[PDB]
Ligand binder design. Structure first.
Ligand SMILES: CNc1nc2cc3c(=O)[nH]c(N)nc3cc2[nH]1
Ligand SMILES: CNc1nc2cc3c(=O)[nH]c(N)nc3cc2[nH]1
Ligand SMILES: [Zn+2]
Ligand SMILES: [Zn+2]
Lengths: 367, 367
């Protein structure tokens, strides 16, 4: 098995489908990565996550470095062994989470000091190494939205300097360089010239994959798509393109249409526990009284184990009762739905009918 | 498959081991019944409950009659279909829960009026019929502890009149009488003469099984065993003996030594979510800092899936983080532990070495 090999099997417009082969397994692209909060995909055993079709999950550097700690996880055999997921894991760099979740933050050229510590590109890489991550993210800065061009520029420039430092730290660790991959993160807010400068900088350094950062920060779908329109083509075509923190099914479809290969979002897990179930006819809230005596499964096409066995009425009852099994069943279905969406996207690109799929999907989903 | 056939395969002193054959499956005795709160064994899919070795679960008449309602469950196909458990289900009568959980209660010869309705023996039987219960419990009154002999007597006497009414209501419903079994409940507090009068009354009516009610209500283990000492022999030998609401592993072993065949308790599920894990060396609280880097499974003999895959350190982390998977893994292990205990009890009685097992179990469990 190779360390990291990306192959594009088919294209339709800007959309691509293919595979990333890594030592711990193959990732089918476009891919959706279920998010692990504290070394767990919430309410799911790893075997269940795999059963939904997931090829890779995301682990959180920020949370894990605090609890149970990176050194501790390393001492216990690494994240894979710790949580019982033996397939690839992508870890975030901590760059976004440190600014989003920390009570107080001090930013400087060295990195970020915070109250739940000091995250730097070097420390981020080290933490991800200690976790045993397969895909390591460069330490970046997610520019707040909106930003002046000047603020966006100085922020993106710092991120690019941090990207080079991340590259060097990663390359310095022989075992990491041998067995893991490193992705760079494009910044530049909504500005085409800065996105270009960022892409150029990242390409000059050279990464295994490129993330489009700085989006899904309140700009809205139209604006996000507008920025993706020009940003993705700036990235190397022959490497995977990862859109961080996205998103709703419609966001995913549109992003794929614009050349994105990888996604992660808390939406299917989070909103699942909240009562939101995804269906091909759009999301439903299972708590609604309308479902109290509905014997149909959450979605009548869905192939997941939940839809094979349990009714809307039962899941309605569980969620209204605050029962853990409610969260379990909703989460498994939603993740499975996301995986089925990705499978349909992959199949349609490979068959050269993705445009029709996107149209058909939207017509029904927003009926 | 028979409606209800109890066979005793082996005995050792007062202990018995055998089987109850019912239409929906075989129950190995002595049996432990995981408790379903609101049509769910908390944090477990039914397939997982079955995987732990459970042959039968307990469903709660009191909770289900309120949410989602008995008629509603019947309309949705019955409790088995609703929750996806196709094996036997025993339902409590509501007699104890109505007094324990209701904000206000009015007691009379008709039954109990309460604020979350009016439960009577007839209504209780009807509700259990609507749920589709396999083992139906007579509607009783659990006398508070302590009670004067006179209060205990009038209470037990009412329960006996209610037992006859439960019998008649059950027998009146052809489909229930054909497919389900009915258990009577002995009362009489801690008084030998009243326990005898209660047993006589129940035997004269005639039931498929007999529960020892009115225990595990704060009397303590010594007193409970003292009462079991004389109470169980009063019950028909050729029918199953069910001790309601018991209990800790040591309570179960002692009760089996005194002729009890069936148990249910919230302990393994409840305390599991709270961080308490059962082991052969006694219970542990997985939240304790001592387990933070412990790579051993919860118990090093346990055959459950949790102990095959995950460490104490990981489960420690999950429970301290408030993660649902923590509750899932703890609950599966604890239920599996209880089932392994029951299997060891069954094997040792069948092999005529139960006395030695009980001694060996206690020496190690309370080391
Ligand atoms: C939910 N929306 C969202 N946008 C994001 C952007 C970044 C980003 O630019 N960098 C890093 N490191 N994580 C991110 C996570 C995001 N999550
Ligand atoms: C946890 N201790 C406990 N003792 C019990 C006694 C009875 C009893 O006498 N009757 C009915 N119906 N349920 C019961 C449930 C119990 N639960
Ligand atoms: Zn489904
Ligand atoms: Zn176990």
């Amino acid at each position: 098995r190779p360390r990291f090999s990306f192959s594009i099997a088919a294209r339709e417009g800007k959309a691509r489908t293919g595979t990333i082969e890594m030592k711990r397994g193959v990732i089918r692209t476009p891919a959706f990565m279920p998010v692990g909060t504290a070394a767990t995909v919430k309410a799911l055993k790893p075997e269940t996550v795999r059963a939904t079709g997931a090829d890779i999950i995301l682990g959180n550097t920020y949370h894990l470095m605090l609890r149970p700690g990176a050194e501790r996880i390393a001492k216990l055999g690494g994240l894979h062994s710790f949580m019982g997921w033996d397939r690839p894991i992508l870890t975030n760099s901590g760059g976004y989470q440190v600014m989003s979740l920390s009570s107080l933050t001090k930013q400087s050229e060295e990195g970020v000091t915070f109250k739940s510590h000091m995250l730097s590109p070097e420390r981020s890489i080290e933490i991800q190494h200690l976790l045993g991550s397969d895909i390591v993210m460069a330490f970046d800065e997610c520019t707040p939205y909106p930003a002046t061009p000047s603020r966006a520029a100085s922020s993106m420039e710092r991120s690019m300097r941090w990207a080079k430092r991340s590259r060097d730290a990663f390359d310095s660790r022989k075992e990491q360089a041998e067995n893991a991959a490193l992705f760079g993160i494009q910044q530049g807010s909504v500005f085409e010239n800065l996105r270009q400068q960022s892409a150029d900088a990242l390409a000059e350094i050279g990464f295994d994959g490129y993330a489009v950062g700085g989006l899904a920060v309140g700009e809205g779908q139209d604006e996000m798509f507008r920025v993706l329109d020009f940003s993705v083509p700036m990235l190397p075509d022959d490497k995977p393109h990862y859109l961080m923190g996205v998103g709703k099914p419609d966001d995913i479809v549109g992003a794929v249409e614009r050349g994105i290969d990888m996604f992660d979002c808390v939406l299917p897990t989070r909103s699942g526990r909240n009562g939101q179930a995804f269906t091909w006819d759009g999301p439903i809230n299972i708590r609604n009284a309308r479902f109290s005596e509905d014997l149909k499964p959450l979605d009548s096409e869905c192939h997941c184990a939940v839809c094979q066995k349990w009714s809307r009425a039962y899941i309605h009852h569980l969620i209204r009762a605050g029962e853990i099994l409610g969260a379990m069943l909703m989460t498994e279905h939603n993740i499975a739905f996301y995986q089925q969406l990705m499978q349909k996207i992959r199949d349609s690109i490979s068959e050269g009918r993705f445009s029709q799929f996107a149209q058909d999907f939207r017509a029904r989903y927003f009926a």
